[PDB]
Amino acid sequence: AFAVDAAKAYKDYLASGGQPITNCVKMLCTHTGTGQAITVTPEANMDQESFGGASCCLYCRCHIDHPNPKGFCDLKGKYVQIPTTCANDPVGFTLKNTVCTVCGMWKGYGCSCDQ
């Protein structure tokens, strides 16, 4: 019945003025990539930064189990594209947002399947 809710704890810590998790590993890249959210190699476009996935995963960084029943990590071993305006808090961004299952872009940050 009981299970720590790390996702909720980080959001509340942020809302009350906490410093976002640091030392997410930012990659060098051309910034001419597809702009998709989560990729096997950095794909930032001109408006994004690419980060090593594991360093942007709340569960990886906090040393706690992943919410997936299999304990699989969506980010580890991959690269996550974060909008430049949100790159001060990549863990918060990946936590709060969701990836369009059709085009692979972030909902509301690239995905246009709704027009």
Partner: protein, 300 residues
Amino acid sequence: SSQAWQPGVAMPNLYKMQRMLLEKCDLQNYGDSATLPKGIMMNVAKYTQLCQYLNTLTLAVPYNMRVIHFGAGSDKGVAPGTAVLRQWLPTGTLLVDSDLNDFVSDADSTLIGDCATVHTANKWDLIISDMYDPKTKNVTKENDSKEGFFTYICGFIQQKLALGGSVAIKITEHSWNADLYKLMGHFAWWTAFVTNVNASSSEAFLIGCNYLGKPREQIDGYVMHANYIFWRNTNPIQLSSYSLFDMSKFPLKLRGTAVMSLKEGQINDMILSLLSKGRLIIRENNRVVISSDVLVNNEN
């Protein structure tokens, strides 16, 4: 001059041929820093330049390539170098990393513990080591060849590096080992490579290119480290981050290098020639299995 637009500087061949005595390393540019792009960590930049330089060598790049990375953890609890290696290496490359202390990593498997506890069934195509103990930078005592993890690395190379494979091993003025330099002569080619972002440091990567499994050349490692320090002492390297802004040719080219299993009796000069040119890897192609020894203790 033109060196500031390169990823770094490799030790020129003439310095390798000297017979210098070991001196203190005194870097004119000591304490300078390069200007890193906004938000980029020193270790991302350093690994990026190491990979850009490795792109200019004749690395074997087979399908199902196997790379192991020692000293992969940072005091930040993450693995910046591993992230760059994974970016650099072809998608699907098996990447294992390791460190003494816990860290979160993008590698396919991570082993935590002293490197001497690491065992692998299989052989590897590329070994990268950033292992370093800052307690070696003691300028008050004599600077002798060091053992510790360097003893492990030499043994690991001789037992677990595929023929045709390559290595890049971090050394410094005081963190070095004579047998490792000697082992450089068991590759078709070798160098000590200084990254332009960290050129104010005596750090270098000792790079052995295409392993042959026997001495092609006899190298005295105490002399060669003296030669390396001589080179560093007399050739200031201008700090530079210029190469970090051009990543269009960064990915390691997937050459599909051939992998064959062969027995020591069959390594003829034709084979040795293909090894030397980056055109062949010799090892089994079984599954990759690793483990770390755990010491068991009951303190009650």
